[PDB]
Symmetry: none
Subunit: 153 residues, 3 copies
């Protein structure tokens, strides 16, 4: 637990014509867990996602947290770009993040987020909504320290 | 349906291209990758290639004002068979901005519809909102 | 590194004008190894103070503002900036003013300041895309060292 990036995926927000409410949530939670102070990078759907992830992995960050672009809309390609960068996926973590918001938000099941490892960087896809983000960070909090420990040895 | 997106930037990140690409997917196109190009010859090249390819629609963004390098409308008129003045006017009248100054045109080149949009995300938004109400009919009439 | 851009214009904030300077500043930051930002766009006056305080609290490495540094009644960017700053960096402000000369002798009328608030570097740029490009030229060979000195 020490270094991280945040990538918020929204073409409108990235163009500066829309609010990013998810990024600040992630930044605050990271501050509570031994990182600090990370500022959101807001990028458009598509190639800019690949570009941000490769850049962050090649920086050797411990953790990348993404928000948005995981649904089933024409333009949601975050999972594809993430899988491309990943060495492998962590299915149980992605499933638990989906189930976290479920009670509750039944459409949770439509988020196609993955999590995985690339090099020694842990990557987490979260949904593009403030509640889905907070619920998924709650899931991550139960396992982050262990996950980072394991990746390091 | 087929399309190309030409983002005209003197700088040549593209903020408008992905917005237009997303709109087009909503309207039955694509996955279209925006081509970001400099003013001038590169605008010509992107238009000519798209017209040759026989795409249904070309959307451009930027280079429509009165700065020394703003020649998107000139390059557009150069490839058009004819202009559709009401559509350019409707795009200018959407949204309201200094732009009254956008000299964008719209028109048909062959069986390809070309639409000039301003180089701002808000101008693009407003423009696309106009297009949303006429695009199906326009493509039908051209065919 | 992280940055915020605060474009200061009531008309741009209102959607009445387009923000052309914000995107110019954003692209320059990316070439200098910044991950970051959307600009922000805020009205003249108190919103400026709001935006700087939010950005200083969040702990960003740099804030670049654009506009509101002139001598018209609604130009209050320098005021709100000095209110947030712990201290000014006079030589950087001066260097930014001079970057417009000799071509735009009215460049000397910008009352823009630079300084540090906490661990955040703040730089006032003028509201014209030419004053902005001219100011980024100054920053090119001092910004990395500035940030290193602050840290
Ligand atoms: Cl999502």
């Amino acid at each position: 637990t020490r270094s991280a990036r945040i990538v918020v995926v929204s073409s409108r927000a990235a163009a500066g014509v829309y609010t990013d409410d998810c990024g600040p949530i992630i930044a605050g939670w990271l501050e509570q867990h031994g990182f600090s102070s990370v500022q959101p990078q807001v990028v458009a759907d598509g190639n800019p996602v690949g570009e941000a992830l490769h850049d962050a992995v090649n920086a050797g960050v411990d953790v990348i947290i993404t928000s948005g672009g995981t649904g089933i809309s024409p333009t949601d390609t975050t999972p594809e770009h993430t899988v491309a960068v990943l060495d492998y996926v962590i299915p149980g973590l992605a499933d638990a993040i989906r189930r976290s918001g479920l009670p509750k938000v039944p459409t949770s099941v439509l988020s196609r987020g993955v999590c995985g490892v690339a090099g020694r960087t842990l990557i987490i896809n979260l949904p593009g909504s403030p509640g889905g983000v907070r619920d998924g960070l709650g899931v991550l909090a139960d396992v982050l320290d262990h996950a980072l420990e394991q990746i390091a040895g």
